[PDB]
Amino acid sequence: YTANLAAFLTVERMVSPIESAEDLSKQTEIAYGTLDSGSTKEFFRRSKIAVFDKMWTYMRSAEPSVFVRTTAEGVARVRKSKGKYAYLLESTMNEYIEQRK
Amino acid sequence: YDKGECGAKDSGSKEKTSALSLSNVAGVFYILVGGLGLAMLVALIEFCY
């Protein structure tokens, strides 16, 4: 009994996911995606950075589709995925939804 | 690999699952009821001798 209790404490003591772009690209439980047509998706397409090209090749072939039609659907999916989904977008719109109910 | 669903990072320590089981609980019981039935196989011979 005392042996099983210490395992779960250490798994969560790992504190995941940490805040970064690569930690989001390293695990696939909590999936992630962007917008279908816009300056956000085209960013990862022609990115010659190893960390970002990895994120592109994931989402370019991530199934089910991690993309969305509009931005209103993207915020609604992060809420109903129980934290198993993340959304990438500009920092401006990201900071206004955090300050709206 | 890239088009693969089970990605090369899906097996690279992706998740840390954990849950206690009763899987091997038997082994311990697997030796005491054999003693509860043995302490009972030797007890009934001391209340008569």
From Swiss-Prot, chain B:
Induction: Down-regulated in the pyramidal cell layer of CA1 in the hippocampus by global ischemia. Detected in forebrain. Detected in dendrites of neuronal cells. Expressed in the pyramidal cell layers of CA1 and CA3 and in the granule cell layer of the dentate gyrus. The chain crosses the membrane at residues 25-45. It is found in: Cell membrane; Postsynaptic cell membrane; Postsynaptic density membrane. Palmitoylated. Depalmitoylated upon L-glutamate stimulation. In contrast, Cys-48 palmitoylation does not affect cell surface expression but regulates stimulation-dependent endocytosis. It comes from the Eukaryota. A lipid is attached at residue 48 (S-palmitoyl cysteine). The M4 transmembrane segment mediates tetramerization and is required for cell surface expression. Homotetramer or heterotetramer of pore-forming glutamate receptor subunits. Tetramers may be formed by the dimerization of dimers. May interact with MPP4. Forms a ternary complex with GRIP1 and CSPG4. Interacts with ATAD1 in an ATP-dependent manner. ATAD1-catalyzed ATP hydrolysis disrupts binding to ATAD1 and to GRIP1 and leads to AMPAR complex disassembly. Interacts with GRIP2. Interacts with GRIP1. Interacts with NSF via its C-terminus. Interacts with CACNG2, PICK1 and GRIP2. Interacts with GRIA1 and SYNDIG1. Part of a complex containing GRIA2, NSF and NAPA and/or NAPB. Ionotropic glutamate receptor that functions as a ligand-gated cation channel, gated by L-glutamate and glutamatergic agonists such as alpha-amino-3-hydroxy-5-methyl-4-isoxazolepropionic acid (AMPA), quisqualic acid, and kainic acid. L-glutamate acts as an excitatory neurotransmitter at many synapses in the central nervous system and plays an important role in fast excitatory synaptic transmission. Belongs to the glutamate-gated ion channel (TC 1.A.10.1) family. GRIA2 subfamily. The postsynaptic actions of L-glutamate are mediated by a variety of receptors that are named according to their selective agonists. This receptor binds AMPA (quisqualate) > L-glutamate > kainate. This is Glutamate receptor 2. The lineage of its organism: Eukaryota, Metazoa, Chordata, Craniata, Vertebrata. The gene is Gria2. The chain holds residues 789 to 837 of 883 of the full protein.
